[PDB]
Amino acid sequence: MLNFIPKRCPSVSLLFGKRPVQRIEVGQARHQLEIPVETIEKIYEGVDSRLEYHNKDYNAMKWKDFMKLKLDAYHLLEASQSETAAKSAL
Amino acid sequence: LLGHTTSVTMGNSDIFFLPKPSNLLKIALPAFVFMPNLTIFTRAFPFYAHTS
Amino acid sequence: GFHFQQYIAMAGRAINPVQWTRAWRRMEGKSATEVYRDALAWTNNQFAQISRASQYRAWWWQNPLGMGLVLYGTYKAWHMIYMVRKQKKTAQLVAAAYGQGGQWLNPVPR
Amino acid sequence: KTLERNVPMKEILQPLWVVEPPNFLRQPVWK
Numbered sequence: 389m390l391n392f393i394p395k396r397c398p399s400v401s402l403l404f405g406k407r408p409v410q411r412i413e414v415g416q417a418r419h420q421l422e423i424p425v426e427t428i429e430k431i432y433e434g435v436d437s438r439l440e441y442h443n444k445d446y447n448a449m450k451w452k453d454f455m456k457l458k459l460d461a462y463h464l465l466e467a468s469q470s471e472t473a474a475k476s477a478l
Numbered sequence: 479l480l481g482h483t484t485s486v487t488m489g490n491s492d493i494f495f496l497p498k499p500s501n502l503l504k505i506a507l508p509a510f511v512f513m514p515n516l517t518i519f520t521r522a523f524p525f526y527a528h529t530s
Numbered sequence: 531g532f533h534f535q536q537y538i539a540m541a542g543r544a545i546n547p548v549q550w551t552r553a554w555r556r557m558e559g560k561s562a563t564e565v566y567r568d569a570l571a572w573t574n575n576q577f578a579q580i581s582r583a584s585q586y587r588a589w590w591w592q593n594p595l596g597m598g599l600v601l602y603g604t605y606k607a608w609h610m611i612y613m614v615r616k617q618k619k620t621a622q623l624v625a626a627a628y629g630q631g632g633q634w635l636n637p638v639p640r
Numbered sequence: 641k642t643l644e645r646n647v648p649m650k651e652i653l654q655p656l657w658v659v660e661p662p663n664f665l666r667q668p669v670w671k
């Protein structure tokens with residue numbers, strides 16, 4: 389994934405927080421996934437506003453947080469690839 | 479004005495400016511070698527310079 | 531390339547003297563840095579329009595050589611309009627000073 | 641409320657900088 393976080397201003401992302409939920413399509417099969425808007429808003433605390441790209445519609449996160457996120461993704465992916473993975477995240 | 483006519487000087491007029499757009503290119507380009515590398519094998523240069 | 535007609539019109543407005551007074555008034559409370567940045571931004575906007583719109587749009591002059599031909603034509607027009615004119619003037623100058631071909635004469639024999 | 645201001649396109653679409661090339665090394669030429 390890229391470090392491009394869409395601006396939640398209505399001129400860019402119309403209707404961001406009008407409802408308490410976000411939805412996304414995942415993969416080639418386009419599975420649906422719903423995510424709480426608070427879980428999402430947790431990103432805009434690490435978002436950095438000095439940086440703006442792609443027609444000034446996307447900000448960038450701080451590398452610390454972005455790489456923590458990438459590491460969680462990578463851990464999940466390698467666990468999926470492996471077979472001795474733990475049956476729980478506890 | 480016998481020995482003063484070669485003293486009327488005028489400066490050159492060349493401008494060394496040329497925009498260098500590299501965003502247009504994505505491949506490397508060949509480059510010349512101008513001098514032999516004397517920093518390596520310095521002691522043998524007169525002895526191996528004639529080979530290839 | 532694009533907007534050649536607009537460029538000709540810009541040159542016309544620039545040579546128009548009334549526009550000189552208009553620019554004199556506009557330059558009130560203005561800096562050389564601002565002027566330079568504005569000109570650079572205008573040029574960048576032109577080139578960015580080209581880079582973006584060439585991906586999906588084709589001008590009336592589109593050809594199997596693309597914008598290369600338009601750029602060559604711009605160069606050739608500049609050449610014939612400015613450099614060949616200067617060559618004509620230099621030719622007449624040399625012909626009046628030394629005679630035709632005077633700049634290529636051999637040194638006086640010793 | 642209604643919109644009356646004449647909105648320029650530069651407040652919406654920002655052009656990329658292509659006049660001077662990029663420096664992927666983020667270091668000056670003398671360095």
Ligand SMILES: CCCCCCCCCCCCCCCCCC(=O)OC[C@H](COP(=O)([O-])OCC(O)COP(=O)([O-])OC[C@@H](COC(=O)CCCCCCCCCCCCCCCCC)OC(=O)CCCCCCCCCCCCCCCCC)OC(=O)CCCCCCCCCCCCCCCCC
Binds near residue numbers: 536591603
């Ligand atoms: C003489 C030619 C030789 C020149 C000198 C030798 C130089 C050699 C190097 C050549 C380098 C070429 C430069 C390439 C860079 C890119 C240039 C470019 O593409 O944009 C040009 C530019 C087009 O601008 P643009 O950014 O593309 O925007 C288009 C507009 O939106 C408008 O949109 P549109 O859809 O309505 O139309 C689009 C486009 C359409 O262009 C076309 O597709 C051409 C249409 C006809 C197809 C056949 C073309 C050839 C035969 C007929 C035309 C003869 C003239 C030669 C035209 C050569 C260019 C094709 O419009 C035009 O370009 C009109 C050009 C025709 C004007 C005719 C004026 C007649 C006066 C001269 C007497 C008759 C000719 C005498 C014999 C000359 C024999 C050499 O054309 C202009 O000249 C703009 C004129 C603005 C009004 C000026 C006031 C009127 C003065 C009329 C003369 C204008 C200058 C033309 C001189 C030639 C006639 C003497």
